[PDB]
Design a protein around this ligand. Structure first.
Ligand SMILES: [Zn+2]
Ligand SMILES: [Zn+2]
Lengths: 92, 100, 167, 53, 73
RNA sequence: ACGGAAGGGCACCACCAGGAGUGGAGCCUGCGGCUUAAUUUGACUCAACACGGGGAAACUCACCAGGUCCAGACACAAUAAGGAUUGACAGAUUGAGAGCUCUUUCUUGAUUUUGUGGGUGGUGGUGCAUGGCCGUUCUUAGUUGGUGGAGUGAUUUGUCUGCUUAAUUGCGAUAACGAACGAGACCUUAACCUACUAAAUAGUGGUGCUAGCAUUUGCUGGUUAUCCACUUCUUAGAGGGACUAUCGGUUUCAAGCCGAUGGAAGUUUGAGGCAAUAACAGGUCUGUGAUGCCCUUAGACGUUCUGGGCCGCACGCGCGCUACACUGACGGAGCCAGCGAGUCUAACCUUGGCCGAGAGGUCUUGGUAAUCUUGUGAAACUCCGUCGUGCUGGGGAUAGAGCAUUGUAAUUAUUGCUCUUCAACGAGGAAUUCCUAGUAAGCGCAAGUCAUCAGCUUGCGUUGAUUACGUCCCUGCCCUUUGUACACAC
């Protein structure tokens, strides 16, 4: 889907920082909390990430929760050009 | 010092053993007080149908949330105040104190 | 600032929603239930369950990310939340847990009469007073019916069922 | 387009929806929880709402 | 759900899709001279000396100011 | 199982007895049919029809005229930075500055797009493929196992002649014994507590400050910082209390029944909640990101935008509101409740005082609550007068004009206020509903829906009756015996 790599990689660095994401299931909002990109862009990026299978997901009262994996964190590590065990969002 | 402590819970016996250890702490430290001002209990009523769809007979259910509220006005210096605040935190019960 | 009415009900639905989350995601981990204890500047969540280190994750990696997730969801601040876990004793005395284990057995593809005999055996040797299970749907067939398995005595009416029975 | 969601929803039943299933009927606004009566009937006791009479 | 002829007239007309034209960015063609500029760009401070002002017919279009630079030089 | 077969017991969803009524008129609202572009639709005895929490302007919304958008992931191959693709102003276009689309040249550039599968979405179908929930059979008391006993066996006994009970509740009788579920028990609420805990977010009295009349001592009052004391009212907590106590009859003289006294309470104290086994080919896929299978998936049945629509009326049915007038209508006065809800990152409840006939507007105030809205000064009622038995000051559909408010929008008038027009209707036919005590009925009141809209519902209280204490005659229920060519079972 058409999304700037700007917003896609904003979401990616958000992910590698945090380690988790939540989204209310509200299109037409286009204002994700904590991320000035679009709600729908967030959710559809996450849809793609799920279809490839680097992230697990749940609805649980319609707030689209997502959580990262190991293939996901290494993928983002090399995507954003980080060293091995640089700074995952699941530290001790 | 003129504080007012209050509790805003539903778990009755929890609230009441809370109030009991509260008041005995206050009186063993020998601090002035009023009694437990026991407000009228408030029953939140929700009255609706049992049936999810529209058919079948008409039949109404009435769910209740029983709330009990208590409060006392107190005077005590700051050290006994803060020890009283940091003690007597029983779960399920909601609490808040104010001053002046 | 807000009324204590809506305060309390928001706490109630808060409990309910996170319980839904946790009985969803920790379902394969021997979940049974959770308990917030309110605190000044803090709130805490035991999870009564069985597979403790499993719900933890490595060095509590899982519970850490769960805290981050739930905190970002409820707009709490970091450090406002702490989770714990509890290897509950008498695992048989938890209807939710036994039902979940039955569910995973079914999806694995176990014989259901066999499964239910085994589960109620396990309960009543865990030392209950009466157990009951039931199935309803399509069962080696094309039409709805049920089965039932039980032993000992039970009850259906009163504050006895509001208190003693776990459902 | 910017008019993809042109219409206002400042009030009414399109504004409200359930927090569980995003449904627009059977809604329970009282005390500010906004759930369908069906789901609420399912969730009442774990909430704390309960039957006495 | 079987009777829908779509009696509306045939109107499946997805617009042009930035048709693959030839080279663009004709500043100028100055052989043995400094390449100067064509399509005098918009005076918007956003503009970075490479936003060609369109000018369809005696009306200028800025693409940086993505619909707004209307003059008559 | 059934019975126009018997025996016994039962219920105002059943009768007698009576009360109010419905059906008679008008009107609100639902179903049907009819119409229409659509007038989406589900449900059709009890056990569908003010039910879908369904009081639809838009939304909801599922329907009709139509205009868009893609949110068609993922994998394969392809286009391709001499550019994959996105977007565009102004004109045309179109209700529509929807580039939707076109004129046009610009903006952007790996995100796409192209095609192959492949996943999703669906208030699309299937509730007869499902779960879950609910309703109902079924508010009645009934249901089952183990061991023994009878029987080839289906099965039976236990689970009962009798008596009693609201009750398979008990006495007991007994090839049965011992158990369990249901009922009862239990939970909530209503009532009693001058006895304990107590308290300006509830009151009482007294003190002082202070107003009036009387003045004589007093009566009626105002006064949170005037305080003093108390908790009967007020709350809540722990607790007590009635268990049929006693008495008198009646009864194998046992369960138990009747009466009387006392007692706050003596129909399981009242009313509810909880509420078994088995079952329906009940309702619902339109509450559910629960849903199997099918269908659809890009000029989509997805989503969104506009305008209509769900109300359309020749006609039939069901709920309810208004009346058909003196036990009254109208105008004045007195004029007393309770349940309960309320604004935070929003604009709820709103008091005061100013304007306006009024709706309403205004600037202010208090409130996250026993605190302020509110003592909700509700209505009915009662006291006075106007009226006069007159389709009349009954009644107020029907219409017209004007004035405000809610909302982006009021047009098939939202709603409200004012004036004017003032029609059927003179107690309702064949039939039919509910009902035994603060119950009916009358009365209005809050909450739910909700931006605004009650004739709806759920609850609250206010005024408050007559008629029975029985029967199975009708309609149906429970047990037993019997008969049967019945078993998707009269
Ligand atoms: Zn819901
Ligand atoms: Zn410019």
């Amino acid at each position: 889907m058409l999304m700037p790599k700007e917003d896609r990689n904003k979401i990616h660095q958000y992910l590698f920082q945090e380690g988790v994401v939540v989204a209310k299931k509200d299109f037409n909002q286009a204002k994700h909390e904590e991320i000035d990109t679009k709600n729908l862009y967030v959710i559809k990026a996450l849809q793609s990430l799920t279809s490839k299978g680097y992230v697990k997901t749940q609805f649980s009262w319609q707030y689209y929760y997502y959580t990262l994996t190991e293939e996901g964190v290494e993928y983002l590590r090399e995507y954003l050009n980080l060293p091995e065990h640089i700074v995952p969002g699941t530290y001790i | 010092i003129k504080i007012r402590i209050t509790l805003t819970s539903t778990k009755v016996k929890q609230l009441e053993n809370v109030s009991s250890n509260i008041v005995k702490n206050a009186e063993q430290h020998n601090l002035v007080k009023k009694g437990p001002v026991r407000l009228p209990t408030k029953v939140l009523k929700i009255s609706t149908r049992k049936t999810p769809n529209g058919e079948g007979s008409k039949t109404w259910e009435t769910y209740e949330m029983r709330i009990h509220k208590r409060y006392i006005d107190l005077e005590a210096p700051v050290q006994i105040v803060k020890r009283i605040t940091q003690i007597t935190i029983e779960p399920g019960v909601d609490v808040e104190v104010v001053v002046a | 600032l807000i009324s204590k009415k809506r305060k309390l009900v928001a706490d109630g639905v808060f409990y309910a929603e996170l319980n839904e989350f946790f009985t969803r995601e920790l379902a394969e981990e021997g979940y049974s239930g959770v308990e917030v204890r309110v605190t000044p500047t803090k709130t805490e969540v035991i999870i009564r369950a069985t597979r403790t280190q499993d719900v933890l994750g490595e060095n509590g990696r899982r519970i850490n990310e769960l805290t981050l997730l739930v905190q970002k969801r409820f707009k709490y601040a970091p450090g406002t939340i702490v989770l714990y876990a509890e290897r509950v004793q008498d695992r048989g005395l938890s209807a939710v847990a036994q039902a979940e284990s039955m569910k995973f057995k079914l999806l694995n593809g176990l014989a259901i009469r066999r499964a239910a005999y085994g589960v109620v055996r396990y309960v009543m040797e865990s030392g209950a007073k009466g157990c009951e299970v039931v199935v309803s749907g399509k069962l080696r067939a094309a039409r709805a019916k049920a089965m039932k398995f039980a032993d000992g005595f039970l009850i259906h009416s009163g504050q006895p069922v509001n208190d003693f029975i776990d459902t | 387009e910017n008019v993809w969601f042109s219409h206002p929803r400042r009030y009414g039943k399109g504004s409200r929806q359930c927090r569980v299933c995003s449904s627009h009927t059977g809604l329970i606004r009282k005390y500010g929880l906004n759930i369908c009566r069906q789901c609420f009937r399912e969730k009442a006791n774990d909430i704390g709402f309960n039957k006495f009479r | 759900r079987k009777k829908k002829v779509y009696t509306t007239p045939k109107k499946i007309k997805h617009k042009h899709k930035a048709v693959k034209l030839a080279v663009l960015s004709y500043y100028k063609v100055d052989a043995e001279g400094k390449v100067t500029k064509l399509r005098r760009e918009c005076s918007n401070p956003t503009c970075g000396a490479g936003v060609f002002l369109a000018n369809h017919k005696d009306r200028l279009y800025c693409g940086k100011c993505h619909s707004v630079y209307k003059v008559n030089a």
